[PDB]
Amino acid sequence: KTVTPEWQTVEKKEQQGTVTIREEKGVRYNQLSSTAQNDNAGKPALFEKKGLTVDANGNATVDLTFKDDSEKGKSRFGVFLKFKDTKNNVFVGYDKDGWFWEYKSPTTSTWYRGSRVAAPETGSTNRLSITLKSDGQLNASNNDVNLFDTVTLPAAVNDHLKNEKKILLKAGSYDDERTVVSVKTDNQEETGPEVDDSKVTYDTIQSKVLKAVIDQAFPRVKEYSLNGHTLPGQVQQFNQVFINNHRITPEVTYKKINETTAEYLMKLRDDAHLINAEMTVRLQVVDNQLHFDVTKIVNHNQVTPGQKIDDERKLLSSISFLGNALVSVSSDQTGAKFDGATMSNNTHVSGDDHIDVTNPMKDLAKGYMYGFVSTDKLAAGVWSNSQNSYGGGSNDWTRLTAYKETVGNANYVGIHSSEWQWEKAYKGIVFPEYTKELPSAKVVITEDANADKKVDWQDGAIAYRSIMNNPQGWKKVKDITAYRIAMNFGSQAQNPFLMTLDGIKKINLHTDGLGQGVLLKGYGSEGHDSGHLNYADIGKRIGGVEDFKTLIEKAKKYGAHLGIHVNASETYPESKYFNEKILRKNPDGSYSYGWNWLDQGINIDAAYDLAHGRLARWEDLKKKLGDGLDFIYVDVWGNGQSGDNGAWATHVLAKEINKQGWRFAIEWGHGGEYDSTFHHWAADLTYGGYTNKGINSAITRFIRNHQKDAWVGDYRSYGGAANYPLLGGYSMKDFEGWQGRSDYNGYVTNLFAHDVMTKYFQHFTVSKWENGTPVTMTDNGSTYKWTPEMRVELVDADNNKVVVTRKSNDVNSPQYRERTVTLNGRVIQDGSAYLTPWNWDANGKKLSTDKEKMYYFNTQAGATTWTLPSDWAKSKVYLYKLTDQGKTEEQELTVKDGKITLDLLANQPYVLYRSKQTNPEMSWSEGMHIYDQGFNSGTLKHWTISGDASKAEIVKSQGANDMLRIQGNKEKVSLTQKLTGLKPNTKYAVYVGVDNRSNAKASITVNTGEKEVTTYTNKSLALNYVKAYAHNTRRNNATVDDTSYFQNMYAFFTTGSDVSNVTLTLSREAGDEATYFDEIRTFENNSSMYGDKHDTGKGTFKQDFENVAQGIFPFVVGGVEGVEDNRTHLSEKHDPYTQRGWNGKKVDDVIEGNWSLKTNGLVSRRNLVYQTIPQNFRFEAGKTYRVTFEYEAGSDNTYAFVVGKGEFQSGRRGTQASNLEMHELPNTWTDSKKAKKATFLVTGAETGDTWVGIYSTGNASNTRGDSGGNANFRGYNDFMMDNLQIEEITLTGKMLTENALKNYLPTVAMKEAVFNLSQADDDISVEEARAEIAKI
């Protein structure tokens, strides 16, 4: 008997309730109760379970079954996640009035308005799921009912609770009322009507191999028979359908077209429900398949896609043959069994049902995705194109429904097609024709199909592949081994298109031609989460359409497939397609705001969007890009931001995308089961926790493992299916920016550790799946039982046979986590090492004999011996070490009676070949006008060095990222290349990224043949805080000593008519310390900032922001939010939406022209938002300048103009905030219709060291009674700059007193000292000036 509670009250004396163990009905519980000495505010009864705690990766999951034992309407229950205290937490729970979320923190505390799901009824049983992630993405469901739309915690709120690991249940009291809930513990230790065929007239259609007995009155199969064996269809007559969810007995006329084909015309009429249609069903046998097809529908009501309709009831919306089993099995038959699959993304809970059809037996009426019935002799499987959904979770994608039906002494289980869809409409407007897809289902019948001398669901599964749908593009999945995100954000152009080609080339070498998948996140507009919906708006700062086309063409040669990250759920005002009609509104007419980051977005009504030309937008992208693109990754879709993102809506989206020739990929793992080939939740193992991963179904994975990356990969933490799956499963990493990750070594290692074998298996189809003994595990706050897979067999078109076997059934054994793989009887993997053949090129084509190869990888040291196949056995054999320079350290191995022994470096890939091989010339950085732009070629030979060439060399950053370094040179060292492929008489920009730790001059110089422009830096003084950038200052990316001061150094120039002798020169003067360079980028640019001219030179400096090459030049982003997707960027005009007045917006996004420099929401941070650095603009020693700009600010004194010098807050004297010269700026709308103008006099410190910038003060903003998105959208918390001008002048005392006057007047309008300033002597000295101004 159990005396041990799974739950206990917390230790805080006053937050204590009463835990008690209670065993009632079948089940055991722990009853949590509140007491008299509790309340619902500071001192509620809190409870706590060992293990239940935010996971290593910062995701909180709760999956709690319970029942409410409180008096009806008297309960206040919920879960606290990431709990710090009563006023610092996230909460999901209910009260009288239903389910809500709520969060509390200094910055922001609110809860859920908007209609709630009703609270649980007393005693009813509740399966609660809650997820809070690292994104701050909160979702919850109760008994598979979504409780609310996804909420994302704001940056401020999430950052504060990021570290909190507490997960508590709350039970609150109020006066006499108490909360009492019983949580379900982990530990818990026939007749029916007979048939009457007397009036039925049957018929038979038959192929060579399959015969089906069919009714002449209604399209139903009585039985099938293959090779004398039988399976029933629908034994009892049911001559009724459901149209628009209404029961209707059709008027049917029948006609047999030929021996294989019969068809029925079916009239459907119900005046009371405005039904008046006819349809033609066709039943056809082909080989061993029965095809059920509605071949024609006619709605006699008048309906026209695109046109509005007066009464949605006149549409023929849904057709249901539910009640007619397409195939079934009888408990009278031997081996009677049904097996089905339902959606599960919980690594602990399989989604599969395995039911013996017996009499007696349990009720069965359930939706399924895949379904099979089998006897001892035959198996059948059913397919349907139904996009029915019975609900969320396991009720979704339920294209089949299985039913128990008692007929006489027999229990039948039959598989029916779920409801079909047809004419649908949104707010009266009928959807486009292409949304309609004629209903269709198929049955396949099979004898043994995997030669194990028994007939079960697996035999159905094998047969099922010839009737099922297949995700468009699925054939490519096998050979995409290296997926990766290349990211751009905030006008920064972190990963230009042509530059991505270098990374493709790099991986090509290190993997010896394995296939790649690069997802361009921020390909459009300014980057990621900018200009959503305008899919055709390829981003100009990363190379425009021209470069994106080049990237696609040249990537083919390396098996690099490209995709783009899009969003069909949300848009920002900047966008072209942004417009009030497309926006989503709540019942009360307020906007459904999306997330606030660069700008505050607004959700869109996807239904409206579909009804109003969304297809046009895909076709524009296609017209713009042309052929070449592989896939489209649709972010967000699934979270209900944009409304209905169900099976039906998702199918329609996928068809739009597919129709352009593109593959479909989604974020959601629940999502797009019918069409997707890639799910981020499945692929990125460390994200969302154990309940948000891939499809946990042996049946589904059996069927489709080779077609998509959608499965449960290896992640020991998550347990269950995730504890070393035998088929592996794609595990993703990256090094080109995503989530601040730019470490290259770990990318390749992971690739061989997990993905090579995962992809090997995808070159075969599963044919046998054998499970072992149930085993007990304990993780993520529970103890649960799990049946692992023990043996999987796969097969090939050419009869090759792979056999994967787990080396132990014992979960405590380490060999539980080990497998052996045999190819045709021969061992290719055992435990930590494998030696796999790989006989396919990057694009999956068969490699020619002479190019066939094997890969070796071993996660430990130690010798391993391998038997060679017959065609390698009597041969020479060469081992190569694979590095970022390709094949290295060639080594002839010794073969000994068909065996070789490898004793090599652990976690290092090697490739074996039958003959000597060489690496090819990569043509690095091609199209970028320079060779090896990022120093990946292992050599500086291409550079003309001048000086002591030993003082320059390529070195690796702390992120394994190659860089040029010059150091310890006692004389000038310089490296020169000629710029290639330039256009005559054309304006250009070039930058090299530079991080200079020496005071010595580090310079970039272009010489056009007609002119020479130069730009230089001394010791760098600005840390790099751009999260998506390779050389930001995170440890894993730091240059050296855990810091990075990398910033782009520019030179602007113009070619003359002769381009044959344009050279670029990086150089460094004498110094001991190091300068590091990386990433030389040269590109067309039409700015003119230097005395109204383009070329770098003397003259007044002006930035109107209209022709910025990249970034926020001459500023660089500061440390105000640490290394981050910085919330300062170039904002784009789209009038009226981005300007004053629209939706109550208080300030302009763009002050003049089409572009301005916008900061969003960074108020009250006490830190530098951005600053100049000397290499972008140098305030020269002793000279005085007049800095001038126009600006908008939505609150008084939230942002300030600052003059500083040296490295800000570097711990050196006077680099502190106090010591900056600071000018707080007032708001620009309360008393003005346009941006105000600022003027400052700045004199360069003698250390050549000075800079100016914008600082976020400690003052609070003033949102004028607004809040939420309204507050964000309207710019109370924003700051915009435009029309910068810096101009050298002659400092004089008078000059100072005049500028002071202008700066002190605004105070005077709400004195005598200031009047006296205005009549200061024309020749006041700078001293007396400062004297007087100080006294004001």
Ligand SMILES: [Ca+2]
């Ligand atoms: Ca079999």
Ligand SMILES: [Ca+2]
């Ligand atoms: Ca402008």
Ligand code: NA
């Ligand atoms: Na923007």
